[PDB]
């Protein structure tokens, strides 16, 4: 018969026939009709005989189920199997993640639960038939689909002046306008964190130096007032006294009323340094607990320069014990006539920026001299000229133009963006040996996929309106264009049509190899064909914008949540192809593949003429001494490069 049973943990025990009987009985006492031991005895006798003298618990339960689903009582088997499976799932939850398979920080687990429970229901009940079929067959990717039922937007550029000047009331929390540098930075961090919860993208602050400039003078005035209180003097003429720069100088060797004109500047510099050092640590820890971007560089004043040189020296020492800071993402705004040439006003700040980018990976560089960035309403004497300087985010997104409004990049943002796979569009028509027919079929299918993605974006726009203003407290009261005439229970459809709808692509080297012998980085004809298809998409986007009364733009997708979710589903359907579906990850939107070795000059020369057709966003990533960064910035200046992120 059977002598020994091995438990699950590993213990060895003697065979006990009164254990199978009591287990079958508890499955017979949960059905419509129970039974006495008439069949239990037969099952146990059959199991005990025909054994191996040593059996496991699972090896006995398998036999129990096999016997139960074989003798006239198939209703006890289906109660036995389900209970066994539930107990197995319960025991597998002590060291694994079974609950995610059925459908580490607790907040992350809850967010994953929400995303997984939301995605399929949106995929089924909200999308139309044609768009659903297009999405199913690995054609188009709808970014942040989990947040679809929450009629949410992507990002916005914060007009920090409103908050800093009038105060903000969000819920039961109200805050007055600031009066020094130790509160303006905190209020900026509060605004970023608050608006992050209301949108599924990043947060950016344009004109970082301009907004905080007025709060460097206030600290100086407070220090002067406190300095004249213990001496009984009268320093009323120093309040509006112009200052060349807030440079710290040693105090020894002076006396009188010119010695205390420097103590105030010294302590003002110290306070501004501490404030800018707290900003970085806060925006790093909050993310490590939020996509944050700050752009600055086009201010010429003693206060803006002080802020720009304190931030650029607190980002040099790093965080903690010298560690580099991942956030916030810092961007330098370079213009011809402000801080570029050696004789311009802020050349030393530019030199410091180039030095810091060689140790701490930041800042980036945004070129204001490009054709698509220049604005005609700019004059370097208006104190509010920052409204006409373009700003970008760390997520590679641009919103400058507008067909029914001003050409500004403040208080505007993205509404939605979707990505179109074109490598499959090339493999699906790789069979043809004649080039002309192959290209014609490629274009014919590209037209249809573009129409489908435009219809999907229009439908998502139609769903995103009908959202009450109260659902977004901070965004639709202080941080959007017309968000000052909207009642709490009023639809935002009267101001929603000021954002950007993005159409992106992933992979162009692969498409050309699946089309012609090589990619754009080796063959000129492939480069011409790629430029042609990009221009065709841009013209179709213009037609869509004219037809649907919206704004459409072409984007180079950042490839942060779509790096791999396009090539596995093509390997499983088309097989391994040399140089196309044999690398793991597709190459980026229009870059140069990381394996085709090139120099910076050739890469820049080939990749430059795409930025004029990628108005929705583009990057110039170069892998690698301040001289190297200076050369990179000069190379960007020589061409129409819009955004660069050399490290």
Ligand X SMILES: Nc1ncnc2c1ncn2[C@H]1C[C@H](O)[C@@H](COP(=O)(O)OP(=O)(O)OP(=O)(O)O)O1
- In the complex, the residues that contact a copy of itself under the rule CB under 8 A are 65-66, 69-70, 74, 77-78, 81-82, 85-86, 89-90, 93, 95-96, 99-100, 102-103, 117, 121, 125, 149
Q: For residues 5 and 483, which CB has a smaller minimum distance to ligand X in the complex? A: 5
Q: For residues 149 and 177, which CB has a smaller minimum distance to a copy of itself in the complex? A: 149
The residues in 31-70 that bind ligand X, with binding defined as CB under 6 A, are: 57, 60-61, 64
Does residue 26 bind ligand X (CB under 6 A)? yes
**Least distance (Å) from ligand X to the CB of residue 223?**
14
Window of 111-119, 152-160, 178-186, 202-210 that interacts with ligand X by CB under 6 A:
178-186
No. of helices (H) and no. of strands (E), the chain: 22, 15
Among ligand X, a copy of itself, none, what binds residue 571 when CB lies within 5 to 8 Å by partner kind? none
Q: Determine contact, residues 367/641, Cβ cutoff 8 Å.
A: yes
Does residue 176 bind ligand X (CB under 6 A)? yes
**Least distance (Å) from a copy of itself to the CB of residue 117?**
6
141 pairs with which residues across the strands?
A: 419
Among ligand X, a copy of itself, none, what binds residue 102 when CB lies within 5 to 8 Å by partner kind? a copy of itself
Among a copy of itself, ligand X, none, what binds residue 19 when CB lies within 5 to 8 Å by partner kind? ligand X
168 pairs with which residues across the strands?
A: 175
Does residue 119 bind ligand X (CB under 6 A)? no
One of 79, 355, 385, 445 touching ligand X (CB under 6 A): 79
Burial of 545 (0-12, 13-18, 19+ CB in 10 A): middle
Strands (E), 489-535: 500-506
Does residue 91 bind ligand X (CB under 6 A)? yes
Q: Determine contact, residues 416/460, Cβ cutoff 8 Å.
A: yes
Does residue 83 bind ligand X (CB under 6 A)? yes
Among ligand X, a copy of itself, none, what binds residue 125 when CB lies within 5 to 8 Å by partner kind? a copy of itself
Does residue 92 bind ligand X (CB under 6 A)? no
Q: What is the CA radius of gyration of the chain?
A: 33
Among ligand X, a copy of itself, none, what binds residue 222 when CB lies within 5 to 8 Å by partner kind? none
**Least distance (Å) from a copy of itself to the CB of residue 516?**
40
Q: How far is residue 479 CA from its own chain's centroid?
A: 19
CA distance 167 to 243: 29
Q: b/e map of 513-527 (b: 16 or more CB within 10 Å)?
A: bbbbebbbbbeeebb
3-class SS of residue 534? helix
Q: For residues 113 and 443, which CB has a smaller minimum distance to ligand X in the complex? A: 113
Does residue 19 bind ligand X (CB under 6 A)? yes
Which residue from 560, 646, 647 is spatially nearest to 604, judged by alpha carbons? 646
**Least distance (Å) from a copy of itself to the CB of residue 76?**
11
Q: For residues 77 and 516, which CB has a smaller minimum distance to ligand X in the complex? A: 77
Does residue 23 bind ligand X (CB under 6 A)? yes
Does residue 78 bind ligand X (CB under 6 A)? no
Does residue 186 bind ligand X (CB under 6 A)? yes
Please report the sign of the dihedral spanned by the C-alpha atoms of residue 107, residue 112, residue 118, residue 122: positive
**Least distance (Å) from a copy of itself to the CB of residue 248?**
59
**Least distance (Å) from a copy of itself to the CB of residue 197?**
20
Among a copy of itself, ligand X, none, what binds residue 175 when CB lies within 5 to 8 Å by partner kind? ligand X
Among a copy of itself, ligand X, none, what binds residue 77 when CB lies within 5 to 8 Å by partner kind? a copy of itself
Burial of 79 (0-12, 13-18, 19+ CB in 10 A): middle
**Least distance (Å) from a copy of itself to the CB of residue 118?**
8
Among ligand X, a copy of itself, none, what binds residue 27 when CB lies within 5 to 8 Å by partner kind? ligand X
3-class SS of residue 193? helix
Q: Determine contact, residues 459/416, Cβ cutoff 8 Å.
A: no
Among ligand X, a copy of itself, none, what binds residue 7 when CB lies within 5 to 8 Å by partner kind? ligand X
CA distance 154 to 504: 15
CA distance 498 to 187: 26
One of 87, 92, 137, 638 touching ligand X (CB under 6 A): 87
Does residue 111 bind ligand X (CB under 6 A)? no
One of 40, 98, 170, 190 touching ligand X (CB under 6 A): 190
CA distance 383 to 230: 37
Q: Which tokens go with 428?
A: 């699906």
3-class SS of residue 304? helix
**Least distance (Å) from ligand X to the CB of residue 469?**
23
**Least distance (Å) from ligand X to the CB of residue 245?**
25
Q: b/e map of 194-226 (b: 16 or more CB within 10 Å)?
A: bbbebbbbbbbbbbbbbbbbbbbbbbbebbbee
For residue 421, the tally of other CB atoms under 10 A from its CB is: 23
CA distance 82 to 20: 17
Binding residues for ligand X, rule: CB under 6 A, are 5, 7, 13-16, 19-20, 23, 26-27, 30, 57, 60-61, 64, 79-80, 83-84, 87, 91, 175-176, 178-180, 183, 186, 190
């Amino acid at each position: 018969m059977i002598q020994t049973v091995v438990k699950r943990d590993g213990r060895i025990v003697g065979f006990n026939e009164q254990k199978i009987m009591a287990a079958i009985r508890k499955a017979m006492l949960h059905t419509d009709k129970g039974e006495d031991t008439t069949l239990i005895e037969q099952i146990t006798d059959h199991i005990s005989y025909r054994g191996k003298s040593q059996m496991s618990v699972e090896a006995i339960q398998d036999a129990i189920e096999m016997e139960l689903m074989k003798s006239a009582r198939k209703d006890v088997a289906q109660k036995y199997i389900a209970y066994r499976n539930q107990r197995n799932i319960a025991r597998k939850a002590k060291t694994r993640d079974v609950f995610m398979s059925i459908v580490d920080t607790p907040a992350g687990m809850m967010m994953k639960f929400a995303s997984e429970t939301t995605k399929p229901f949106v995929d089924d009940y909200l999308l139309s038939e044609d768009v659903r079929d297009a999405v199913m067959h690995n054609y188009i990717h709808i970014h942040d689909k989990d947040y679809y039922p929450t009629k949410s937007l992507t990002c916005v550029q914060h007009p920090l002046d409103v908050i800093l000047n009038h105060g903000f009331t969000a819920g039961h929390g109200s805050s007055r306008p600031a009066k020094r540098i130790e509160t303006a930075a905190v209020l900026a961090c509060i605004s970023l964190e608050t608006c992050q919860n209301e949108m599924h993208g990043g947060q950016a602050i344009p004109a970082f130096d301009f907004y905080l400039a007025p709060y460097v003078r206030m600290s100086y005035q407070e220090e002067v007032k406190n300095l004249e209180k213990l001496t009984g003097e009268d320093l009323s003429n120093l309040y509006d006294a112009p200052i060349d720069d807030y440079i710290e100088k040693p105090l020894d060797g002076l006396q009188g009323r010119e010695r205390l004109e420097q103590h105030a500047i010294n302590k003002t510099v110290n306070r501004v340094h501490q404030a800018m050092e707290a900003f970085i640590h806060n925006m790093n820890t909050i993310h490590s607990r939020v996509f944050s971007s700050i752009n600055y560089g086009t201010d010429t004043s003693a206060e803006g320069r002080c802020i720009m040189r304190e931030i650029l020296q607190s980002t040099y020492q790093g965080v903690g014990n010298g560690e580099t800071a991942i956030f916030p993402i810092q961007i330098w705004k370079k213009k011809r006539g402000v801080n570029y040439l050696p004789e311009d006003r802020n050349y030393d700040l530019y030199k410091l920026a180039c030095k810091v980018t060689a140790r701490r990976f930041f800042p980036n560089f945004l070129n204001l001299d490009a054709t698509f960035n220049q604005n005609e309403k700019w004059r370097a004497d208006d104190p509010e000229r920052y409204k006409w300087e373009i700003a970008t985010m760390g997520c590679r997104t641009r919103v400058f133009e507008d067909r029914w409004g001003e050409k500004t990049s403040i208080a505007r943002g993205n509404l939605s963006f979707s990505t179109i796979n074109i490598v499959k569009l090339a493999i699906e028509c790789m069979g043809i040996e004649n080039e002309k027919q192959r290209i014609d079929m490629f274009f014919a299918k590209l037209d249809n996929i573009l129409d489908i993605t435009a219809k999907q974006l229009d439908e998502r726009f139609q769903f995103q309106k009908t959202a009450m203003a109260k659902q977004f407290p901070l965004l639709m009261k202080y941080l959007w264009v017309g968000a000052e005439n909207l009642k709490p229970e009023e639809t935002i459809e009267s101001v929603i049509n000021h954002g950007t709808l993005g159409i992106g692509f992933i992979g162009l080297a692969e498409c050309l190899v699946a089309l012609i012998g090589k990619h754009h980085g080796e063959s000129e004809k492939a480069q011409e064909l790629g430029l042609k298809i990009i221009t065709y998409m841009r013209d179709r986007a213009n037609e869509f914008s004219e037809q649907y009364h919206h704004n459409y733009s072409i984007l180079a997708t950042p490839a942060e949540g779509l790096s791999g979710k396009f090539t596995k589903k093509d390997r499983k359907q088309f097989g391994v192809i040399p140089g196309v579906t044999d690398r793991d990850y597709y190459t980026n939107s229009n870059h140069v593949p990381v394996y085709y070795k090139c120099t910076a000059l050739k890469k820049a020369q080939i990749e430059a003429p795409y930025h004029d057709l990628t108005r929705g966003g583009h990057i110039f990533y170069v892998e690698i001494n301040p001289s190297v960064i200076e050369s990179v910035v000069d190379m960007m200046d020589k061409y129409n490069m819009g955004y660069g992120s050399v490290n």
